[PDB]
């Protein structure tokens, strides 16, 4: 997992549960309490998965609902950290714009393999967003997209319509509706 974004979870995780949890789940696998990852670092994903194993024992919360959480939360600490991803969107162009920002993320990184979060139109005011990866982080995917629609103050109904492994890859395929019609049919 590239550090830029684990950097942002570590933060995450102080808002939502406070610093002893996070300092001890940390001090578990053997870092520094008050370690900044960069973008410099690729972090391995299993020591993310153990410091989320005890933030979960801590807490009492199941980790599936603990990156359920972070998803949400996250999208917050995103926004204070990098502005521009958000500045002068609305949701709509936000999410089709996901999969673009992972591969860019991502790119000078070899063996990267980014999680695919293509997404296309279904109908004048809904999308069809389908999370692929090796990672099976479906609560972080699905806790993100929560967040978006709270920090664009633009209500959402989320269907889940698949979820499971396709030769390899976790996938989870939504569609996502908005209130208002967000597309229009166009010459091709
Ligand atoms: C400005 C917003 C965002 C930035 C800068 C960002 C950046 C990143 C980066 C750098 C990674 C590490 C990927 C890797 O090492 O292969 C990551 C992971 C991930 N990103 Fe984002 N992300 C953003 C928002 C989102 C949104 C809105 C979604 C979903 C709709 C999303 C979905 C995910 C997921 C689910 C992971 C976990 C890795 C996995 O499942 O394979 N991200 N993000």
Same mark, same amino acid.
């Given at each position: 997992?590239? =550090? ?163 030769? =390899? ?20």
């Amino acid at each position: 997992m590239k =550090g830029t974004i684990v950097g942002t979870w570590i933060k995450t995780l102080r808002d939502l549960y406070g610093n002893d949890v996070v300092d001890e789940s940390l001090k578990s696998v053997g870092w520094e309490p008050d370690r900044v990852i960069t973008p410099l670092e690729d972090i391995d994903d299993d020591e993310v998965r153990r410091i989320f194993a005890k933030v979960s024992e801590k807490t009492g919360k199941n980790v599936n609902e603990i990156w359920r959480e972070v998803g949400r939360q996250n999208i917050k600490t995103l926004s204070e950290w990098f502005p521009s991803y958000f500045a002068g969107r609305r949701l709509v162009n936000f999410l089709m714009m996901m999969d673009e920002v992972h591969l860019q993320l991502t790119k000078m990184i070899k063996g990267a393999t980014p999680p695919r979060l293509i997404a296309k139109p279904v109908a004048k005011d809904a999308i069809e967003m389908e999370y692929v990866s090796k990672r099976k982080m479906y609560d972080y995917f699905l806790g993100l997209i929560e967040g978006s629609s709270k920090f664009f103050k633009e209500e959402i109904s989320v269907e889940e319509v698949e979820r499971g492994e396709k030769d =390899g890859f976790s996938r989870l395929k939504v569609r996502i509706k908005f209130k208002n019609p967000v597309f229009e049919y166009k010459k091709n």
